[PDB]
Amino acid sequence: AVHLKMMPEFQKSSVRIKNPTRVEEIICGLIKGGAAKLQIITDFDMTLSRFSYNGKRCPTCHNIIDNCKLVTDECRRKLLQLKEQYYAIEVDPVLTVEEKFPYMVEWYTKSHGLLIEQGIPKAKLKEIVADSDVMLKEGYENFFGKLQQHGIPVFIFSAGIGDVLEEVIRQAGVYHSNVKVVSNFMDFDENGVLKGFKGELIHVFNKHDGALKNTDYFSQLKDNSNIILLGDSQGDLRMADGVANVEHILKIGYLNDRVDELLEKYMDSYDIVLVKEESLEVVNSILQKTL
């Protein structure tokens, strides 16, 4: 029997929940099923990593390269100008999510295009990452560690850059066997220098597409019919569209930004909404009762 009232992690002021009885019933399904039926499906940028530290804005995977020493101030100016004009579309109240698709395709293509120009070697991503200002959410050793310990599938599904992501987690010591990473991976020329990106593009609004194109992975996990989903965008709610069967799914959303404009919508679509929150402790607390 689950009582949110008696879990101190749910009493923190950043936790918003439209439907506490509904959430208690989902978590109770999670606990009943135990390890055998659990899998995690998760975004990375701003979900597993922090949106801010010590008054400062934290880098996305892409930002790690934008900001590194192999990239010119004139490239950074251009990249900023793309952010300006395209982010305004991303967040445009009037356009339907579907209308923003071609815009997003353009933005990520152009900005990946500028990085291919800078000449980024694979051999160098280790150092770039080590020198960067990236940070994982408080509680990440525990999150990943209980999950590896119990062999729980973790599907990290990212519109970032996959080589960067994987380097972050490897240097954190948490890129264990149970962790599968699906992202935009770089394509290297025979000098081991970035020439383009592999596969089809994952951006913020089309994770339905990628989720259905990973059927292999999901059908292997048919028995894992209890899911915990973690994201920070509305688009991350699509990340479970490929799952074989669902008995219980819990959806946890990081509302980092645009709090007043988006609270009602986030509270409406995510089960738990974590407001300006830089830790994984609510999810860790669920893992502790479940595992």
Known binding-site residue numbers for Mg(2+) = 43, 45, 232
Binding positions for CMP = 90
Nearer to Mg ion by Cβ, of 167 and 232: the residue is: 232
- Alpha-carbon gap, residue 100 to 138, rounded angstroms: 33
* 248-255/38-42 β-pairing: unpaired
- Listed in sequence order, the DSSP H helices in the chain are 20-33, 61-66, 73-90, 97-118, 125-131, 140-149, 162-171, 207-212, 215-220, 259-269, 281-290
Query: With contact defined as beta carbons under 8 Å apart, do 206 and 198 qualify?
Result: no
Question: Any catalytic annotation for residue 43?
Answer: yes
Q: Please identify which of the residues 43, 163, 236, 271 carries the catalytic annotation.
A: 43
For residue 213, give the DSSP letter: T
Spatial CB neighbours of 84, under 8 Å, sequence gap ≥ 6 = none
CB 272, min distance to Mg ion, A: 16
CB 47, min distance to Mg ion, A: 5
Any contact of residue 278 with Mg ion (CB under 5 A)? no
Nearer to Mg ion by Cβ, of 46 and 243: the residue is: 46
CB 44, min distance to Mg ion, A: 6
CB 266, min distance to Mg ion, A: 13
Nearer to Mg ion by Cβ, of 45 and 278: the residue is: 45
Backbone angles phi, psi at 162, to 5 degrees: -70, -30
Per-residue x/- track, 229-258, Mg ion (CB under 5 A): ---x--------------------------
Per-residue x/- track, 35-64, Mg ion (CB under 5 A): --------x-xxx-----------------
CB 246, min distance to Mg ion, A: 22
Spatial CB neighbours of 63, under 8 Å, sequence gap ≥ 6 = none
Binding positions = 43, 45, 90, 111, 158-160, 207, 232
Q: How many CA atoms lie within 13 A of 244 on its CB side?
A: 15
Any contact of residue 167 with Mg ion (CB under 5 A)? no
Question: Which residues 137-166 are close enough to bind Mg ion by CB under 5 A?
Answer: none
Any contact of residue 277 with Mg ion (CB under 5 A)? no
Asked whether the CA dihedral 229, 235, 238, 239 is positive or negative, the reply is: negative
Active site positions, annotated: 43, 45
Kindly list the residues in this chain that would bind Mg ion in the complex (CB under 5 A): 43, 45-47, 232
